[PDB]
Enzyme design. Structure first.
Site, short mmCIF file in Angstrom:
data_model
loop_
_atom_site.label_atom_id
_atom_site.label_comp_id
_atom_site.label_asym_id
_atom_site.label_seq_id
_atom_site.Cartn_x
_atom_site.Cartn_y
_atom_site.Cartn_z
N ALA A 110 48.53 -19.18 32.63
CA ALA A 110 47.94 -20.30 31.92
C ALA A 110 48.32 -21.50 32.73
O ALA A 110 47.25 -22.01 32.75
CB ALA A 110 49.32 -20.61 30.64
N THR A 170 47.38 -12.61 22.52
CA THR A 170 46.63 -13.45 21.23
C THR A 170 44.76 -12.29 21.37
O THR A 170 44.48 -13.41 21.55
CB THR A 170 47.29 -14.58 20.43
OG1 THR A 170 46.34 -14.27 19.40
CG2 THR A 170 46.72 -15.64 21.18
#
EC number: 3.4.25.1
Lengths: 240, 234, 237, 210, 142, 240, 242, 250, 247
Positions: free
Chosen positions: H120, H72
């Site tokens: 992540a 994003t």
């Protein structure tokens, strides 16, 4: 003594380590060094032994060494150990600049030098450095003068004005009588004059045996020539 | 006078054939407070008298748990007791992790003896200076062991170590037939131990602050009682 | 003193290092060496400790070449000096390889002095019992004369002597040295100082070693015994 | 080159209640199309009211659980028998997983327990330590079937906050029965561990064995 | 009883694996300036693309010595390897020549290499930290 | 008396001597045992006196003669623990020589190797010399019968014949007289039994005492093997 | 002189007479230990030990003063208890290694040599000290029965009968008499009786002691080391008393 | 010397590989020293090509794939009032139910923020480690660490492992008295780039329409960041001042 | 029966005939050579107070740091050799930060004290069996004041012997004897934070050769809410004036 002074790792029955005291005794035999910080500068003064007639003076090393463009260092004690300490300090300054992109602070470099000196007291197969150091400068992007003293045992302290070496007690008493922390010398000239007058209490010949170095913020380090020191000495004598 | 010339280290014999540093390490045990251990066919108990620096301080922990089935009490040098207790915990952990076994008490005694013997024959270190009492329960029943830091271990029904432990030891030896048959009644065995350790008291009284108890048994994991948990035993 | 001089890593109650002082004292038992720097060159002279006529003279116990610009005079133990000389030659070649330039004299002197200082800080090492007189030329300072001692300290000089008769030789040099001196006058002064300070009856050629660093570039010349005889005849000694 | 990884496909599901947590898993252990065993539990009580499961390559999951339990033993030894909280356990498991960053465990890990306030908590881990707290998570071969069943039954439809333990157990059993009917790798049995303030309780149910 | 060296690959890595060149500003990170390796050498690059014979050559003599010690243990007992190792440790421990790299005569006598030459003997072989004091610090562990 | 640090370690005394080496030499005579070694035409014979006064000892376990390799035998003068240490070291050295160079180790080369090890002991401060004297005998494939001796000082040399012990001077004098009479450096015999008998007779004449079968040990080296005789063999040799 | 001044403050040092005084002091330490004897019979060995009576708190079956190195090797020691335990552990390790390597129980001479080399290695450096124990060990192998005695210097020998400890002189005199009176040899049970008698004679000043006897005999224990049971021990004690 | 004897005295432990201290520490045999390392220890396969092994075994059925951070759009910019950080908060969907809002911005300390991209786990682990390092530095020097020093620490760390398999891109944002506000971008390739405006992720071109001046008020800067994120497309907003970061949410 | 010199008190690894290690005793003497530090624990926090002893007036009074922060919930006061204390403080800070990194929680005060004592053990064998790291024992003592959820407010005394005690009130340094004697009489379980501060100031004034003021004394406190904070000069001066007015 009494059998408790033959190693660095032996505590005295009254809780002393005599070899550290003996290293301090070795420091006491070196030439006197003085550090005085004013409102906006730090001045390091050094006593130089009288140069011999046939001794070359153009390449003789100075008593005040530039660790970095903002930090300078003077010493008292064994001259040969000071070179090792100065080299290590310069290497550490460059290493810190490479690792963190930021130049060292004065306190950080003082702590590193004290750490090296402490490490050289942690083995029975090594000899401690018989040197006491005065580290002066300004923190990067800062205008507060910094002056520190380091000892062979690895202890460091922060001083407004300090003396080390031979006959340093008299100079310390003179500074205590003639220095006020709440009203420090507000100009470079006053600080230099106070340093020179303090050094003149123990220097025999006079101007030719005095070295003065001035450090200001923003990496401004100046080594005063013999003519300026002579002018200061003559003015002090005339006002006397 | 002549002993003064041959007690420098642990790698020197005297002309008469004595190893004085090990003797001094053994003498260091009596500088600690008294601890008592005893057992029956079903349970093993440790009783410890704790000391404090002053009224504003806390009391020293004399009983340390090594595993759910084994523990010990110490008398002597604190650093040596810490080192040996951590070592025994490591050995029990290794046994449980690798073999899914509960480490035997006799195996622990042998390991402690092997570890302690090394410091008495090499230069550079010093012998350990703490005595230990080890209690445990395993497939062979209940066990009590006495460890001496010269590298010695003995298996006993009951014993006492530390300062003035002779009175407690004499009481335990006199009444051996009493506590040797206290099976299935932990309270009676603990009471016998408390009386034995009271036999070694000098101008002092057991309180809920200086008394520590530990018990291991057939279905009882190694449990330590301090404070109010020992109030009913006083 | 006897309880604080068995090891090099122990300070005395007065803060002294007795092994370093003894190493310094051992230098007084060596043959005299003299370095004189003139306005256009450097002269190195030394006296051999020869006691027999069976010694080979044509084939160097006091004078060595560190490189084409730098030479040394040695006073003290010969083998320790040879160790340090090989180290200095390797360091000079390393600097030349790294920077494609000749090493400055002071850098080499400081490296050797740091090595000798380090040999006074480890309990398993004894100090080097040697003193060096370095004579060199570089593009930064020109002609340079240095001295280093067992303690690891080094000093710059115009005229300097090391060895057995340092005091008298230094007195004579102080009484006779001039700043605007030439190479030939420096040679004569060094020879006369050696002759006056010698404990022997005469200063013959076979007891002398001579070297000159001059310009035509910069040239090093280690004098042969015949040239030493010729200069001795010319001076009047 | 020798291949050190394998696959023993199973299904696990963790759900956090208002004041309880549940971690369930199928007991089928398989290799390819063969059945290694019909009752091989994969959800374990790790002490201090924490339930753990590592689904995937069975050897790696067993090693991870063993290491975590040994670390808990040392944590009790070194901190005066302090109770290990669920968030601290999640951090320890993250470090254990990331310690194998260049030679990872091939597992997906779920832990469950009660948080400091007494609410049910479930943590989910990626194979290299990335973890998050979640209300519900299914993992394994039949997760894509179990999750829609719960989503249709529950709203995250009576809200999950007001469900009791028995209702959650019934929902888990029904979802696993449906997955057993639809998925070849799911069957034989289902084991559920429930964590409440009173401790950990185990329940077992049978599933279709074909 | 190994002939070709085995177990040569590293099993774990960390940023502080080389204890001798740790940074003083960030002790968890290495000091690249004092490493003097060119400044662009991450440790990970040393884990890949190595010549397969390098590990065999670097550990060959140690492997042969270990096999000899194991044979002595099997045939003579524990005391013989214990004594050989003790002699070698004593000789290696008291030798400290910061200005030289050649091995001692006594070490060669113990290793039975008095009249033997290999390419390690023929080919035995900065700005920062290549002096006597670095060797003193490494030897004394201070 | 060493009178200094030489009381413990091998360093030079002001006279230029190593006292620990000389004391190891003195220790070599602790057992009060004499040994003799002679060379035949194609054999070498060693004979060692055996003293077992204690009745509780097992005589069969008392021996100072060792088999080092197939062709090399060794006799040791000094305490038995150092003797066994040296025997194991020599066995390992011979086997390693065979592995490394492809042929059997000669007696003189092994003696030189042990002498080099002894030199290590003499020069190293933290290593003590072994208080034994070693005598290696063999029939080398190039040099024929061979006797070599090594001492704690690191000195080794070969002999036509040798004797070691407290009474070695008389045995050596008798050997010198016999060799002067015969004007040869070896014994002119064809069978090793005759050489054994001659050496026994020489030992008896030199020591001035009679020996039984249990008072001596005999080892014989031929070009094939080195072997030690048993009690029956020595008893048979005595009858002559 | 028994005290070498100036040459006894460090191990691995030669005196001007060629002596090592630390080893001699370890021998002095050994000579103050408990009396232990070993007798070699026709086809086996017998070991006997005198014990001081300790407190009743000791577990009777967990306090054994005779160590079993291996199923065919028995051992006793006099001197420092931890040194004896260390040496026995090393002996067990050596026996296990030999049996694993060569599929046979280790012969007694090889075991003796390995122990002797290990003990001798501790007289070579100043960083260690010699063992303060003298060890009498023995057993049965394919070549017969063997009995050995090992000293702190690393010197060991095979013996017909050996004794160590405080009462070593009387025990040695009795052993010499036993050897003289039995030129043909001796059996295992007669050896047990004589060992009990010798221990009793050597003990005789605090007349309170116990006796431990072990034996290994081809005919009696099938070449295995076993402790003497109640009946034979009682018979030996009665014979010693009368 | 007796240690040498123990080394030569005896198999089972060798097969268990527990004669090495690292193996004992990793399995918590001798204690919890494994959880006491300032520099974490990372396991590698003992083979000639660890990198190829990892790349082959990571780029291939169950849910056991390495979690990848959201791609994003994230924006960071600096103005006279501090720093504005805006992240398009649109969490992905899977076989799980979120207990609370998922944060795509790592709070390193009450004064430092980082942005997640790539792996992540790598971002979370190494930014927590960086927070620990910064806390230790501030304790030692008795002063707040500058943003340049922390970014350089992270850059050196990731450079030491370059090519091993790490995948991360982060923006370190901080306001100190000496430096003012400062934004650095650090990725797993070792690049360390100081900047004024950073747009990362899909739609970065649309979000780079930042109307930008060094005189914007706090409300104007927040509105501009929100509008830029919306043009790239909820939005999570962070305002970093000298006193720390403040989370707004929008 | 003759008088000869004994040398059992020189080696740290040498026992006395009665089983003592006198180098540890001499390290304690070195601790007693230092300046005074006092800690008092109440139910509202823990108060630490130190005396700033300056050899010369030219020394910067704001440079002597006898009170340091180990963590937000843990503070420490030192007495003895400064370099040993610097090493110990570095170790304690590393332990606290690493425990937070690995467990996501604050470390217990007793756990940190145990870690520091384990470090102090390094002149011999380590707690986990590590080899010797130091040639001599430390010559500095520590007072560690902390707050944790498990045990509330705690004060610990840590010595170079590797042993620590829990104290309600403790004093170390040159004037530790009279200060501890006063603490034994003036401490009770119902003290407030303000009363504890006043008592610390009074006891420091009693055992200080120089006149007590803000320049030669320093105060600090730890509370559950505010954490660990060292008072500035103005607050200490106000407290000293209040104590003077009360007395």
């Amino acid at each position: 003594m009494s059998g408790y002074d033959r190693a660095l790792s032996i505590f005295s029955p009254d809780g002393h380590i005599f070899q550290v005291e003996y290293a301090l005794e070795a420091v006491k035999r070196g030439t006197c060094a003085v550090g005085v910080k004013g409102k906006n500068c730090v001045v390091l003064g050094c006593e130089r032994r009288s140069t011999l007639k046939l001794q070359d003076t153009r390449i003789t090393p100075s008593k005040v060494s530039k660790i970095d463009s903002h930090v300078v260092l003077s010493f008292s004690g064994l001259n040969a150990d000071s070179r090792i300490l100065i080299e290590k300090a310069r290497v550490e300054a460059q290493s810190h600049r490479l690792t963190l992109e930021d130049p060292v602070t004065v306190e950080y470099l003082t702590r590193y030098v004290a750490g090296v000196q402490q490490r050289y007291t942690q083995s029975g197969g090594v000899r401690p450095f018989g040197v006491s150091t005065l580290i002066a400068g300004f923190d990067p992007r800062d205008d507060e003068p910094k002056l520190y003293q380091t000892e062979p045992s690895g202890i460091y302290s922060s001083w407004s004005a300090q003396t080390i070496g031979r006959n340093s007690k008299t100079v310390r008493e003179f500074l205590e009588k003639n220095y006020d922390r709440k009203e420090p010398p507000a100009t470079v000239e006053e600080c230099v004059k106070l340093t020179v007058r303090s050094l003149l209490e123990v220097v025999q010949t006079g101007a030719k045996n005095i070295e003065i170095t001035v450090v200001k913020p923003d990496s401004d380090i100046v080594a005063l020539s013999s003519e300026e020191i002579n002018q200061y000495v003559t003015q002090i004598e005339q006002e006397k | 006078m002549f002993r003064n010339n041959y007690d420098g280290d642990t790698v020197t014999f005297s002309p008469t054939g004595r190893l004085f540093q090990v003797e001094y390490a053994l003498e260091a045990i009596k500088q600690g407070s008294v601890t008592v251990g005893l057992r029956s066919n079903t349970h093993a108990v440790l009783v410890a008298l704790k000391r404090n620096a002053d009224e504003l301080s806390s009391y020293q922990k004399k009983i340390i748990k090594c595993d759910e089935h084994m523990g010990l009490s110490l008398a002597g040098l604190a650093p040596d007791a810490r080192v040996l207790s951590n070592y025994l915990r490591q050995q029990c952990n290794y046994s449980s992790l690798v073999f899914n076994r509960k480490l035997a008490v006799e195996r622990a005694g042998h390991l402690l003896c092997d570890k302690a013997q090394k410091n008495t024959q090499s230069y550079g270190g010093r012998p350990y200076g703490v005595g230990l009492l080890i209690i445990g329960y395993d497939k062979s029943g209940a066990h009590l062991l006495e460890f001496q830091p010269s590298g010695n271990v003995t298996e006993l029904y009951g014993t006492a170590i530390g300062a003035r432990s002779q009175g407690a030891k004499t009481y335990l030896e006199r009444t051996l037939d009493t506590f040797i048959k206290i099976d299935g009644n932990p309270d009676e065995l603990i009471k016998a131990g408390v009386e034995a350790i009271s036999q070694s008291l000098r101008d002092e009284s057991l309180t809920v602050d200086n008394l520590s108890i530990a018990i291991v048994g057939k279905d009882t994991p190694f449990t330590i009682y301090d404070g109010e948990a020992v109030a009913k035993y006083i | 003193s006897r309880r604080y001089d068995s090891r090099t890593t122990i300070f005395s109650p007065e803060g002294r290092l007795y092994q370093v002082e003894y190493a310094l004292e051992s230098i007084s038992h060596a043959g005299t060496a003299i370095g004189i720097m003139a306005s256009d060159g450097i002269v190195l002279a030394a006296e051999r400790k020869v006691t027999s006529t069976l010694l080979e003279q044509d084939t160097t116990e006091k004078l060595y070449k560190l490189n084409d610009k730098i030479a040394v005079a040695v006073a003290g133990l010969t083998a320790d000096a040879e160790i340090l000389i090989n180290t200095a030659r390797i360091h000079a070649q390393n600097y030349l390889k790294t920077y494609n330039e000749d090493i400055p004299v002071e850098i080499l002197v400081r490296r050797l002095s740091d090595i000798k200082q380090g040999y006074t800080q480890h309990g398993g090492l004894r100090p080097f019992g040697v003193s060096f007189i370095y004579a060199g030329y570089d593009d930064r300072y020109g002609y340079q004369l240095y001295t280093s001692n067992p303690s690891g300290n080094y000093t710059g000089w115009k005229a300097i002597s090391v060895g057995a008769n340092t005091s008298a030789a230094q007195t004579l040099l102080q009484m006779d040295y001039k700043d605007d001196m030439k190479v030939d006058d420096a040679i004569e002064l060094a020879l006369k100082t050696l002759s006056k300070t010698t404990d022997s009856s005469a200063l013959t050629y076979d007891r002398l070693e001579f070297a000159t660093i001059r310009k035509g570039e910069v040239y090093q010349k280690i004098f042969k015994p015949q040239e030493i005889k010729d200069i001795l005849v010319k001076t009047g000694i | 080159q020798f291949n050190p990884y394998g696959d023993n496909g199973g299904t696990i599901l963790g759900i956090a209640g208002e004041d309880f947590a549940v971690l369930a898993g199928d007991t089928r252990n398989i290799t390819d199309y063969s059945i290694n065993s019909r009752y091989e539990p994969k959800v374990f009580d790790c002490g201090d009211n924490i339930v753990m499961s590592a689904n995937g390559f069975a050897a790696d999951g067993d090693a991870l659980v063993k290491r975590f339990k040994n670390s808990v033993k040392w944590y009790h030894f070194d901190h005066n028998d302090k109770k290990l909280s669920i968030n601290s356990a999640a951090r320890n498991i993250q470090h254990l997983l990331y310690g194998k960053r260049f030679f990872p465990y091939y597992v997906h890990t779920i832990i469950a327990g009660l948080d400091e306030d007494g609410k049910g908590a479930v943590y989910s881990f990626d194979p290299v330590g990335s973890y998050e707290r979640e209300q519900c998570r299914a993992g394994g071969a039949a997760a894509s079937l179990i999750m829609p069943f719960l989503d249709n039954q529950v709203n995250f439809k009576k809200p999950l906050k007001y469900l009791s333990v028995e209702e959650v157990i019934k929902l888990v059993r029904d979802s696993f029965t449906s997955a057993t009917e639809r998925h070849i790798q799911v069957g034989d049995g289902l084991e559920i561990l429930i964590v409440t303030k009173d401790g950990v309780r185990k329940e077992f149910y049978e599933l279709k064995r074909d | 009883m190994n002939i070709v060296p085995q177990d040569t690959f590293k099993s774990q890595v960390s940023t502080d694996q080389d204890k001798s060149v740790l940074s003083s500003a960030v002790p968890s990170l290495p000091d690249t300036l004092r490493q003097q390796e060119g400044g662009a050498v991450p440790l990970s690059t040393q884990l890949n693309d190595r010549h397969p014979l390098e590990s065999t050559l670097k550990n060959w003599e140690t492997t042969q010595r270990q096999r000899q010690m194991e044979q002595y243990r099997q045939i003579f007992g524990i005391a013989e390897p214990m004594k050989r190792t003790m002699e070698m440790e004593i000789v290696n421990r008291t030798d400290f020549n910061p200005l030289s790299t050649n091995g001692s005569i006594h070490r060669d006598i113990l290793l039975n290499k008095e009249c033997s030459i290999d390419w390690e003997d023929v080919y035995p072989g900065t700005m920062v930290g290549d002096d006597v004091h670095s060797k003193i610090e490494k030897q004394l562990g201070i | 008396s060493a009178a200094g640090y030489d009381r413990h370690i091998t360093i030079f005394s002001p006279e230029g001597r190593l006292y620990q080496v000389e004391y190891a030499f003195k220790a070599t005579n602790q057992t009060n045992i004499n040994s003799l070694a002679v060379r035949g035409k194609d054999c070498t014979v060693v004979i060692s006196q055996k003293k077992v006064p204690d009745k509780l000892l097992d005589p069969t376990t008392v021996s100072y003669i060792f088999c080092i390799s197939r062709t090399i035998g060794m006799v040791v003068n000094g305490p038995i623990p150092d003797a066994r240490n040296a025997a194991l070291r020599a066995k390992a050295e011979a086997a390693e020589f065979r592995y490394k160079y492809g042929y059997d180790m000669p007696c003189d080369v092994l003696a030189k190797r042990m002498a080099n090890l002894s030199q290590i002991y003499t020069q190293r401060a933290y290593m003590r010399p072994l208080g034994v004297i070693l005598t290696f005998v063999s029939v080398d494939e190039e040099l024929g019968p061979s006797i070599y001796k090594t001492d704690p000082a690191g000195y080794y040399v070969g002999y036509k014949a040798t004797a070691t012990g407290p009474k070695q001077q008389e045995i050596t004098t008798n050997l010198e007289n016999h060799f002067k009479k015969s004007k040869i450096d070896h014994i002119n015999e064809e069978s090793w039994e005759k050489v054994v008998e001659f050496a026994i007779t020489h030992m008896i004449d030199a020591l001035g005492t009679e020996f039984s079968k249990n008072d001596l040990e005999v080892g014989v080296a031929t070009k094939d093997k080195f072997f030690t005789l048993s009690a029956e063999n020595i008893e048979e040799r005595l009858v002559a | 002189t028994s005290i070498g001044t100036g040459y006894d403050l460090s191990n691995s040092v030669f005196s001007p007479d060629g002596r090592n005084f630390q080893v001699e002091y370890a021998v002095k330490a050994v000579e103050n230990g408990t009396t232990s004897i070993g007798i070699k019979c026709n086809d086996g060995v017998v070991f006997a030990v005198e014990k001081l009576i300790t407190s009743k708190l000791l577990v009777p079956q967990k306090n054994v003063k005779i160590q079993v190195v291996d199923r065919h090797i028995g051992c006793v020691y006099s001197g420092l208890i931890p040194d004896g335990r260390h040496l026995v552990n090393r002996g067990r390790e050596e026996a296990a290694s030999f049996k694993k390597l060569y599929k046979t129980p280790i012969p007694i001479p090889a075991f003796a040599d390995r122990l002797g080399q290990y003990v001798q290695a501790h007289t070579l450096y100043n960083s260690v000290r010699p063992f303060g124990v003298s060890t009498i060990f023995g057993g049965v192998d394919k070549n017969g029965a063997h009995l050995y005695m090992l000293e702190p210097s690393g010197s060991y020998w095979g013996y017909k009968g050996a004794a160590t400890g405080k009462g070593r002189q009387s025990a040695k005199a009795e052993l010499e008499k036993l050897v003289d009176h039995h030129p043909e040899g001796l059996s295992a049970r007669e050896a047990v009786k004589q060992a009990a008698k010798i221990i009793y004679l050597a003990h005789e000043k605090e007349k309170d002691f116990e006796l431990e006897i072990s034996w290994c005999s081809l005919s009696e224990t099938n070449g295995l080391h076993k402790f003497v049971k109640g009946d034979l021990l009682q018979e030996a004690i009665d014979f010693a008393q009368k | 010397m007796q240690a040498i004897a123990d080394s030569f005295s005896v198999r089972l432990v060798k097969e268990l590989q527990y004669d090495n201290e690292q193996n004992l520490e990793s399995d918590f045999v001798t204690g919890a020293s494994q959880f006491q390392r300032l520099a974490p220890s990372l396991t590698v396969p003992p083979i000639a090509s660890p990198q190829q092994f990892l790349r082959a075994h990571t780029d291939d059925n169950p849910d056991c794939k390495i979690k990848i951070a959201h791609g994003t759009t994230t924006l960071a910019f600096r103005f006279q009032g501090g720093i504005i950080v805006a992240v398009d908060s649109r969490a992905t969907a899977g076989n799980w139910v979120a207990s609370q809002t998922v944060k795509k911005v790592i709070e390193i300390n009450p004064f430092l923020l980082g942005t997640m991209a790539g792996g992540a786990a790598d971002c979370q682990f190494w930014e927590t480690w960086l927070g620990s390092q910064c806390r230790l530095h501030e304790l030692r020097e008795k002063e707040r660490i500058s943003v340049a020093a922390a970014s350089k620490i992270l850059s050196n760390l990731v450079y030491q492992y370059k090519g091993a398999g790490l995948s991360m891109g982060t923006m370190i944002c901080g306001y100190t008295r000496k430096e003012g506000p400062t934004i650095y971008y650090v990725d797993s390739d070792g690049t360390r780039l100081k900047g004024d405006i950073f747009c990362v992720g899909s739609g970065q071109t649309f979000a780079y329409g930042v109307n930008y001046k060094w005189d914007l008020s706090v409300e104007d800067a927040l509105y501009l960041g929100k509008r830029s994120i919306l043009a790239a497309a909820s939005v999570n907003l962070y305002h970093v001042t000298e006193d720390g970061w403040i989370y707004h949410g929008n | 029966m003759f008088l000869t010199r004994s040398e059992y008190d020189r080696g740290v690894s040498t026992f006395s005939p009665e089983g003592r290690l006198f180098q540890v005793e001499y390290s304690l003497e070195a601790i007693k050579l230092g300046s005074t530090a006092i800690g008092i624990a109440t139910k509202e926090g823990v108060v630490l107070g130190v005396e700033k002893r300056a050899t010369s007036p030219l020394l910067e009074s704001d440079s002597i740091e006898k009170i340091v922060e180990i963590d937000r919930h843990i503070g420490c006061a030192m007495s003895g050799l400064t370099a040993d204390a610097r090493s110990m403080i570095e170790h304690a800070r590393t332990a606290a930060v690493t425990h937070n990194l690995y467990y996501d929680e604050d470390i217990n005060v007793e756990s940190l004290t145990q870690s520091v004592c384990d470090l102090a053990l390094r002149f011999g064998e380590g707690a986990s069996g590590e080899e010797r790291l130091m040639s001599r024992p430390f010559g500095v003592a520590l007072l560690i004041a902390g707050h944790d959820a498990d045990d509330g407010y705690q004060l610990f005394h840590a010595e170079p012997s590797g042993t620590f005690y829990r104290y309600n009130a403790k004093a170390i340094g040159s004037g530790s004897e009279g200060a501890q004697a006063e603490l034994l009489n003036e401490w009770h379980s119902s003290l407030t934070l303000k009363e504890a501060e006043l008592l610390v100031l009074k006891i420091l004034k009693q055992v200080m050769e120089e006149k007590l003021d803000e320049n030669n004394a320093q105060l600090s406190c730890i509370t559950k809410q505010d954490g660990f904070k060292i008072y500035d000069n103005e607050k200490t001066a106000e407290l000293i004036k209040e104590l003077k007015e009360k007395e």
